Amino acid sequence: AGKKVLIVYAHQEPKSFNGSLKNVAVDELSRQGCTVTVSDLYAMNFEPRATDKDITGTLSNPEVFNYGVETHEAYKQRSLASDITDEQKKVREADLVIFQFPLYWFSVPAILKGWMDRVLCQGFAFDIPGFYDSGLLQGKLALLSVTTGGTAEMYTKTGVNGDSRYFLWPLQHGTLHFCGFKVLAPQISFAPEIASEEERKGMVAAWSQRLQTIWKEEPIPCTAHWHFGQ
């Protein structure tokens, strides 16, 4: 439909449940005629660490290194490391960014956290001021497709993990909404590692099926109320 999709994918194993969800996404969006790009972070050996190597030009303050300050200035000067600007090009061109990952400690795997830390820099993804609904990636969509060890039941208000929406807050609100994304409803595939084959098949089909009508979805209200209720 003229639409461009970036999938940022964070799993080590192509045959994994995550690998299958990523491939289903590529297959279905490709079938629709979408332009599709995948950043396979582990295969890229993507650098997760925020360091002074991310700036190649003269530092604003070479005596006391401030990562946010220096990357902001390097973005404006175009002296960021090229692995960062490679990702920024993908994001800039994308209409929808899908994140495909296993839940690691109620969050993204570190290699994907590094992508968020390094790619979404000041000047590119937001400004101060110029964030949340004024973020610089406004007009773009984002979607978290996450798999969990824990069951849906564990991820309820009265379950040991609390509601699943609780752990989405830093990702959907603190990061994506902050940068101006509108956020589509998460795809959460609960506990595939202990699900039956039928249940596993059912979770993969649910995702493929959803993707058929993804461009007709409205985003969530990315608010404290949506995440926490009551």
Add this chain to the structure above:
Amino acid sequence: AGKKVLIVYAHQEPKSFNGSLKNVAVDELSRQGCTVTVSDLYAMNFEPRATDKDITGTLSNPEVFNYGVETHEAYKQRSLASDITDEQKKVREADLVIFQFPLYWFSVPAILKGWMDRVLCQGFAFDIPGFYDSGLLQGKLALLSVTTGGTAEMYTKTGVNGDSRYFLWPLQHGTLHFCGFKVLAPQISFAPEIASEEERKGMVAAWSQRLQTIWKEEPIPCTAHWHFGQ
């Protein structure tokens, strides 16, 4: 009374506000007679990525790589990578683990997320059974000392960031409580970057003064109610 403290520290710059807070902790805990160890992650060029390099020798299934399974087995077989087991030794010996870090996207910097992902493996930090109250690090204390870009006001329930307790949930509950830590109240130093020198000195003194009686502290009730309730 010989208490052992591990400080896991994630900042690039010794002269930073985080650097000063880390140094205050070392100084004060050292003064008290405590045994103190610091894992300076950036200085160590600590590996954040969860990969098959974290298992030495032969994988337990060389055709389909499952990080969780492989590291569980490697832990039991004494064949984890030495950077991991070095950290596990420090944690094993510690009575208190302090994490010192700037807030990156409502969470820990990726290098510290990588520490959590790779060090806190099944068999070491948790198991079936042994999680939440019975996690394998029960008896230990953990404390998050965080600095933010955003103001205290932004981190209120109706402020644009929401309550700071909202972003603590994945860290304190999903990670630390899950491994059996009792969680000490977080230390949150709001917006040192725009604070006055006097305000900044006050935040450092608050931390130094808190450390004087840290062994007298009651842990928080690490509950959904604490994080999300009234």
